[PDB]
Design an enzyme around this catalytic site. Structure first.
Site, PDB file in Angstrom:
ATOM      1  N   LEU A  44       0.819  -1.210   0.062  1.00 45.65           N
ATOM      2  CA  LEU A  44       0.084  -0.209  -0.055  1.00 45.65           C
ATOM      3  C   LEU A  44       0.943   1.308  -0.111  1.00 45.65           C
ATOM      4  O   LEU A  44       0.413   2.322  -0.483  1.00 45.65           O
ATOM      5  CB  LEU A  44      -0.832  -0.071   1.295  1.00 45.65           C
ATOM      6  CG  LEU A  44      -2.111  -1.271   1.059  1.00 45.65           C
ATOM      7  CD1 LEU A  44      -2.952  -1.312   2.382  1.00 45.65           C
ATOM      8  CD2 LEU A  44      -2.711  -1.722  -0.104  1.00 45.65           C
ATOM      9  N   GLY A  45       1.968   1.405   0.591  1.00 47.93           N
ATOM     10  CA  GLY A  45       2.696   2.550   0.686  1.00 47.93           C
ATOM     11  C   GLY A  45       3.883   2.128   1.524  1.00 47.93           C
ATOM     12  O   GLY A  45       3.925   0.891   2.100  1.00 47.93           O
ATOM     13  N   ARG A  46       4.777   3.217   1.659  1.00 44.98           N
ATOM     14  CA  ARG A  46       6.160   3.262   2.272  1.00 44.98           C
ATOM     15  C   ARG A  46       6.447   4.437   2.439  1.00 44.98           C
ATOM     16  O   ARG A  46       6.589   5.355   1.517  1.00 44.98           O
ATOM     17  CB  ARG A  46       7.073   2.248   1.183  1.00 44.98           C
ATOM     18  CG  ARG A  46       6.934   2.623   0.009  1.00 44.98           C
ATOM     19  CD  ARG A  46       8.069   3.471  -0.561  1.00 44.98           C
ATOM     20  NE  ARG A  46       9.552   2.964  -0.105  1.00 44.98           N
ATOM     21  CZ  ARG A  46      10.586   3.105  -0.806  1.00 44.98           C
ATOM     22  NH1 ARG A  46      10.437   3.595  -1.951  1.00 44.98           N
ATOM     23  NH2 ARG A  46      11.432   2.427  -0.379  1.00 44.98           N
ATOM     24  N   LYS A  48       8.850   6.833   5.807  1.00 42.19           N
ATOM     25  CA  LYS A  48      10.033   7.052   6.893  1.00 42.19           C
ATOM     26  C   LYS A  48       9.987   6.152   7.990  1.00 42.19           C
ATOM     27  O   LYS A  48      11.337   5.816   8.479  1.00 42.19           O
ATOM     28  CB  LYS A  48      10.264   8.488   7.449  1.00 42.19           C
ATOM     29  CG  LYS A  48      11.385   8.880   8.231  1.00 42.19           C
ATOM     30  CD  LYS A  48      11.629  10.568   8.262  1.00 42.19           C
ATOM     31  CE  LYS A  48      10.320  11.071   9.012  1.00 42.19           C
ATOM     32  NZ  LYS A  48      10.594  12.752   9.319  1.00 42.19           N
ATOM     33  N   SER A  50       7.813   2.988   8.066  1.00 38.81           N
ATOM     34  CA  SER A  50       7.238   1.487   7.722  1.00 38.81           C
ATOM     35  C   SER A  50       6.911   1.373   6.293  1.00 38.81           C
ATOM     36  O   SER A  50       7.029   2.395   5.673  1.00 38.81           O
ATOM     37  CB  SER A  50       6.062   1.402   8.788  1.00 38.81           C
ATOM     38  OG  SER A  50       5.029   2.521   8.093  1.00 38.81           O
ATOM     39  N   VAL A  52       3.734  -0.706   4.386  1.00 40.42           N
ATOM     40  CA  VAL A  52       2.666  -1.186   4.651  1.00 40.42           C
ATOM     41  C   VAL A  52       1.719  -1.914   3.549  1.00 40.42           C
ATOM     42  O   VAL A  52       1.883  -1.670   2.395  1.00 40.42           O
ATOM     43  CB  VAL A  52       1.538   0.118   5.218  1.00 40.42           C
ATOM     44  CG1 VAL A  52       0.442  -0.426   5.562  1.00 40.42           C
ATOM     45  CG2 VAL A  52       2.222   0.934   6.140  1.00 40.42           C
ATOM     46  N   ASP A 155      -0.435  13.575  14.438  1.00 42.69           N
ATOM     47  CA  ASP A 155      -0.471  13.445  13.139  1.00 42.69           C
ATOM     48  C   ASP A 155      -1.875  13.403  12.393  1.00 42.69           C
ATOM     49  O   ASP A 155      -2.101  12.506  11.657  1.00 42.69           O
ATOM     50  CB  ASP A 155       0.521  12.262  12.387  1.00 42.69           C
ATOM     51  CG  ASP A 155       1.052  12.416  11.191  1.00 42.69           C
ATOM     52  OD1 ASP A 155       1.129  13.521  10.703  1.00 42.69           O
ATOM     53  OD2 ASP A 155       1.780  11.272  10.663  1.00 42.69           O
TER      54      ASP A 155
HETATM   55  O1  LIG Z   1      -1.892   2.597  11.872  1.00 42.64           O
HETATM   56  C1  LIG Z   1      -1.327   2.408  10.741  1.00 42.64           C
HETATM   57  O2  LIG Z   1       0.011   3.056  10.284  1.00 42.64           O
HETATM   58  C2  LIG Z   1      -2.269   1.870   9.768  1.00 42.64           C
HETATM   59  C3  LIG Z   1      -3.326   1.156  10.327  1.00 42.64           C
HETATM   60  C4  LIG Z   1      -4.194   0.579   9.210  1.00 42.64           C
HETATM   61  C5  LIG Z   1      -3.847   0.456   7.916  1.00 42.64           C
HETATM   62  N1  LIG Z   1      -2.836   1.087   7.572  1.00 42.64           N
HETATM   63  C6  LIG Z   1      -1.804   1.714   8.201  1.00 42.64           C
END
Ligand SMILES: O=C(O)c1cccnc1
Length: 334
Positions: A44-46, A48, A50, A52, A155
Site C-alpha cells: 500500500l505504501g512506504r 520514513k 514503515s 504497509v 499526526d
Molecule cells: O496505523 C497505521 O499505520 C495503519 C493502520 C491501518 C492501515 N494502515 C496503516
C-alpha cells in the site's frame, strides 16, 4: 524572559493519576503473535517509519493490514504499541489485532484490522455537505476519546483517516507520532506533517497539548469545505507559518507570540510581512459554495486560532450547531 508555561484546559491530569504502567511504555513487554499466520498480498505504501501491506490471515482467510516497522529505537515501537493497546475499542480508533516479528526485516510488524477505504484524493472531490459534517463528527469522537485517555495523536491529516465510504465507517490510524500528555512537559515540535502543523510547532513552543490536534483538524475541515487540499500549502516549515499568516493575519500572530513570550526565529523576519486577517468568504467560489454555511465557518474559525488555549476542545466541538443533524441521525433506537 523564557516562554510562559501552558497547560491543557481539559484532561490535564488524567495520566497523573493512572498507574505508572499505563503511560510508562519503556517498561512495556510486547505480546508476540505468530508471524506465520500472515501473508503479504499487496503493498500500500512506504515512508520514513514503515512499509504497509494488505495481507491475509491464512488461518481464517481474513483480510488485515500489516505495517512492518523500519528499524527505530525499542522505545519508539513500544510507545506506538502501548498507545494502540490503551485506545483499543475506543470510538473510531483503528484496532491493533496482532504484533509479530517479521523474519525478513528483523523488525516488529503491527497487524491491523482492514478498512476498505477510498483514497482521500478521490473521495474528497465527491463529499457532500452532510458527508463532511458526518466524518468530522466521527473524527471528533476519536480525538475526544484519545485526549480523554491522556494521548495526543500528533499526526492528524487525511492520509491518517481511513474511510470506508459505503459503510460510513471511519478509523483514525498511524499512532506512530502519538504521545502521552503530562502537564508541563516540553515536547518535541518535530511532529505532524508540514501542512497540518500548528503555529505552536512552527514558532518552537514546546509546552503544547491535545489542542495541537484541533489545529490539524481545522486544516482538514478547511480543505474539505473549500475544496483545496491541503489548505495551507507551505514550501517548508517557515513558509508554512507565512501561509497561515496570510489568512489569519499577522496582528493575531504577534499577539500570540507576545502572550507566550515566544522568541521568534529571526529567519521569520524577512518572510512574515504584514497581513490583514481575511474573511473566510475569500475562499468561497462556485465549486465549493454548496459546502460552506455560516455554521461551517463559525466552527472553522474556532479551530483555526493561533492561541492553542483558545481553540475548541474535541468535546466542545461536538456540541457545535454544525453537527446538529449528524447528532440527531446517530441517535439510533437500535
Ligand atoms: O496505523 C497505521 O499505520 C495503519 C493502520 C491501518 C492501515 N494502515 C496503516
Amino acid at each position: 524572559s523564557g516562554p510562559v508555561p501552558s497547560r491543557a484546559r481539559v484532561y490535564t491530569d488524567v495520566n497523573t493519576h493512572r498507574p505508572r504502567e499505563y503511560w510508562d511504555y519503556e517498561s512495556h513487554v510486547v505480546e508476540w503473535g505468530n508471524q506465520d499466520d500472515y501473508q503479504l498480498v499487496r503493498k500500500l505504501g512506504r515512508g520514513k517509519y514503515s512499509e504497509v501491506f494488505e495481507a491475509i490471515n491464512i488461518t481464517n482467510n481474513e483480510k488485515v493490514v500489516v505495517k512492518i516497522l523500519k528499524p527505530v529505537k525499542k522505545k519508539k515501537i513500544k510507545r506506538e504499541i502501548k498507545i494502540l493497546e490503551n485506545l483499543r475499542g475506543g470510538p473510531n480508533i483503528i484496532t491493533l489485532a496482532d504484533i509479530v516479528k517479521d523474519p525478513v526485516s528483523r523488525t516488529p510488524a503491527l497487524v491491523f484490522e482492514h478498512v476498505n477505504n477510498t483514497d482521500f484524493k478521490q473521495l474528497y472531490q465527491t463529499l457532500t455537505d452532510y458527508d463532511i459534517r458526518f466524518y468530522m463528527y466521527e473524527i471528533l469522537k476519536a480525538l475526544d476519546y484519545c485526549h480523554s485517555m491522556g494521548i495526543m495523536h500528533r499526526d492528524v491529516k487525511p492520509h491518517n483517516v481511513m474511510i470506508d465510504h459505503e459503510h460510513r465507517k471511519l478509523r483514525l490510524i498511524d499512532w506512530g507520532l502519538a504521545e502521552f500528555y503530562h502537564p508541563g512537559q516540553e515536547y518535541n515540535v518535530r511532529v505532524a506533517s508540514r501542512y497540518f502543523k500548528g503555529p505552536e510547532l512552527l514558532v518552537d513552543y514546546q509546552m503544547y497539548d491535545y489542542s495541537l490536534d484541533m489545529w490539524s483538524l481545522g486544516c482538514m475541515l478547511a480543505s474539505m469545505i473549500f475544496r483545496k487540499e491541503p489548505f495551507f500549502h507551505g514550501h517548508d516549515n517557515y513558509d508554512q507559518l507565512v501561509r497561515i499568516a496570510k489568512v489569519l493575519g499577522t496582528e493575531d500572530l504577534y499577539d500570540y507570540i507576545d502572550k507566550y513570550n515566544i522568541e521568534l526565529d529571526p529567519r521569520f523576519n524577512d518572510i512574515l510581512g504584514r497581513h490583514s486577517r481575511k474573511r473566510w468568504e475569500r475562499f468561497v467560489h462556485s465549486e465549493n459554495q454548496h459546502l460552506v454555511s455560516p455554521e461551517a465557518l463559525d466552527f472553522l474559525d474556532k479551530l483555526l486560532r493561533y492561541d492553542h488555549q483558545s481553540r475548541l476542545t474535541a468535546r466542545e466541538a461536538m456540541e457545535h450547531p454544525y453537527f446538529y443533524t449528524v447528532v440527531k441521525d446517530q441517535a439510533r433506537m437500535g
